[PDB]
Design a binder for this molecule. Sequence first.
Ligand code: GMT
Ligand code: GMT
Lengths: 360, 357
Amino acid sequence: RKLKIGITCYPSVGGSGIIATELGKQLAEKGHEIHFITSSYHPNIHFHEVEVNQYAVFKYPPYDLTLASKIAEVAERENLDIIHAHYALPHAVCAYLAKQMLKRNIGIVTTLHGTDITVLGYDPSLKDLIRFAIESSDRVTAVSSALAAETYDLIKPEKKIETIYNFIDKNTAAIKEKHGILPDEKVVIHVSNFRKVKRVQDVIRVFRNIAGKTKAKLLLVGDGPEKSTACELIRKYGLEDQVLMLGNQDRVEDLYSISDLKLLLSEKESFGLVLLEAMACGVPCIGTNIGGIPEVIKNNVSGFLVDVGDVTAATARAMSILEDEQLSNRFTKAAIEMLENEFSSKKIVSQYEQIYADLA
Amino acid sequence: RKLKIGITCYPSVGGSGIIATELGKQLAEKGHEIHFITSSYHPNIHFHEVEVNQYAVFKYPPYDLTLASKIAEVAERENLDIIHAHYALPHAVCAYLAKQMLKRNIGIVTTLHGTDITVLGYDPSLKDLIRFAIESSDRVTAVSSALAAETYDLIKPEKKIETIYNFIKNTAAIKEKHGILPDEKVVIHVSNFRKVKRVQDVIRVFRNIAGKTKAKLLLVGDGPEKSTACELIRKYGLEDQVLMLGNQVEDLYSISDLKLLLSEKESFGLVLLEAMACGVPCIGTNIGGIPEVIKNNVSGFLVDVGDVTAATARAMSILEDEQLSNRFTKAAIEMLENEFSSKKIVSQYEQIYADLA
Ligand SMILES: CC(=O)N[C@H]1[C@@H](O[C@@H](CC(=O)O)C(=O)O)O[C@H](CO)[C@@H](O)[C@@H]1O
Ligand SMILES: CC(=O)N[C@H]1[C@@H](O[C@@H](CC(=O)O)C(=O)O)O[C@H](CO)[C@@H](O)[C@@H]1O
């Protein structure tokens, strides 16, 4: 049965935004009627805008209250069966308030992406609010089992948290030519928001060890607070010519397509959607053995996992992969099979769809 | 029964923040345990602060969620019987969330001061939220019967809204400090200078007065429309006859002969009670709660919104009839000790808390 699903999220802040929007499109293609309720296409996809109108009275812009009001407005006017929030805070709480205002039993689905753990590390006193958010949702999913376990540890809600993974939606010569890459050169890639937990310094010390060993370029893709930290480490090591600070990019597939190695060396990472994208483009990955990364990369099967801060071992693995087309190609092969099965959008979208069917 | 009472509000937005804090003081002086939960001498009174950050996750700082979190935290820890919110938005909604988070029952008291009407004017989409806030509080109060009625007419909450009112020198030296000479009459206006205060109307009225008698004008406070005000002054060349002060106010009330409040929207007008208490006769507009404070021709005058003509005539009667001025003044102070006394009102809020606890 076609359903009418509200989706409330930050429009696009990397991973979760991409996921939420793609999930909406895919559902639309199966005949559901999708209403995005955010800040900010198909006949069945509609957009409703949360606009904050602070002219007086409010000391801070009442975006949470405004969002809740808008969810309830759209829920009533469009007869929504489901509101699917992404993040506990603020979105599940806003969905909750909206349900209370509506005075009917709309189903609330909440997807945890890891940001509630982050927020909690800066302000531990939010624990009970996050627990509330979870416990007030009808069904709760997490993008990895590790995240679900960390939520149970730190939040301890009375709620089943179901694991539903993330998913993803040629002329490499030309692309290398554009970025002035020589057919001669190995290509290492890293795509992130350059926040401290991404440990970009570890990516550069790994790369530096690499490029003192073979003809190599690093593609640094993204923007964020530790970018100036990055440059500095690059200049300190004198790798200015061998690194393409590419800042944030369009057509990220082009960059993964030219690359031979993807590194994600985070200390915190609930999933790592950039791993799937590198996988889909045939790039073997080295990730840290933390969060949900071991659920994506299986060590010495579809990639390598290292310890946080282990630049030495990451360098060893990098070389192993770069020098050996055998290993690289079997890693690559194993990874594509994961993509076609555990991480395919047909499979994940139908897991979310089943949730909605259950509640409707 | 001594009680543990949480108070959440914006701690000094002008009038409502004075009321909420004074109310706290009065309850602590009768020995209840008071806990302020806000942004921000007695020891039955404590303070809890909310800190609000984006942390690179939140698009905006989630004041409302952090505050609701803190209320739940304080309520649990200190076993609060009551959380008394001032304003439906955000504060009653934050109290509601906290209550829902709490295992304990807790009584939610919300007092309306009229800002929720202001919010609704700017954003008509928040009507249902505001109605929800009101309906989800256990007991709701409004600082005038006019506000209670307008709330009902505009928001239509099905909830009882109970009227509980607001409550409350060397003049030579002070006048000297301000270059006010001893034969100058002194008109005063105290506000936040918002459009609904109609400071332009205050200034027209004053021009008329300063044209009929030797007069200064104390314009006290700050706000967007202060600039509007200054231009109107220059447009009439009254620069020299106006003192523009920010906030520091009793001193000024004591050197004044007449207080004007000519708003088009005013749920109560706390400045009125401060003026009255300092022996200053008031002229107010005939809207909102101002007719609940001023008795026309008895404890001041009331006029129609915008009626600069009527306002000038009343002003002149006051300024040149010491008899009238003194009778207004005495009647206003008797009202103060009866209807607007802190002893009375504070006991009214207590009865609410007793019922719920
Ligand atoms: C810190 C963290 O756990 N970030 C996860 C989280 O990343 C956040 C962004 C962030 O890192 O704060 C997001 O994308 O909304 O969600 C992604 C999508 O599910 C994951 O791929 C990221 O691992
Ligand atoms: C516009 C309005 O109704 N303002 C009332 C309202 O004033 C607001 C400030 C304002 O919005 O004017 C406040 O103090 O929070 O509350 C006061 C205390 O109850 C009343 O004295 C004012 O009449």
